[PDB]
Design a protein around this ligand. Structure first.
Ligand SMILES: CC(=O)Nc1ccccc1CC(=O)N1CCC[C@H](C(N)=O)C1
Ligand SMILES: [Zn+2]
Length: 140
């Protein structure tokens, strides 16, 4: 589990969105596994606007933050899960790291801010949904 809290937005994995998220929806994209809802309180996270390919992510199944090298956002085939069939997910970045399904929502960050959230996982792989292109998260 986990979310990004920037401005008056809450960014979560679409497959983990709650009823309150759907009832206060701002934007969602199944191809990216992302959903954004509105919040009453202002958040403290800032979004990275950069081209970093190194950063650190939070792994809830180890209670640890790990430094990782990650690929550029791309269209990757992901195997079936209980939330989606086997399909192509867009704006996904892969790294070598520990991951389990409940680790979705953990933040990937660099020196500039938040880069994305854990969305997928393989044997010794972790995939992150990028948010750096979502410029509108910084306003309204
Ligand atoms: C075996 C493993 O590492 N599982 C793992 C770890 C961490 C997170 C997720 C998984 C499995 C996974 O990739 N998916 C299940 C949840 C929805 C994902 C999606 N965005 O399409 C696909
Ligand atoms: Zn950066």
């Amino acid at each position: 589990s986990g979310a990004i809290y920037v401005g008056n937005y809450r960014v979560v994995n679409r497959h983990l969105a709650t009823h309150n998220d759907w009832a206060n929806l701002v934007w969602e994209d199944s191809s990216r596994d992302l959903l954004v809802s509105s919040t009453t309180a202002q958040g403290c996270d800032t979004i990275a606007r950069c081209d970093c390919q190194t950063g650190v992510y939070y792994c809830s199944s180890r209670r640890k933050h790990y430094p990782v090298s990650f690929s550029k956002p791309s269209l990757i085939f992901v195997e079936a899960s209980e939330y989606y069939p086997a399909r192509y997910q867009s704006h996904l970045m892969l790294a070598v790291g520990h991951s389990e399904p409940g680790d979705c929502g953990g933040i990937l960050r660099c020196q500039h801010g938040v880069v994305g959230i854990v969305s997928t996982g393989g044997n010794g792989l972790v995939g992150f949904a990028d948010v750096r292109d979502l410029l509108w998260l910084d306003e309204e």
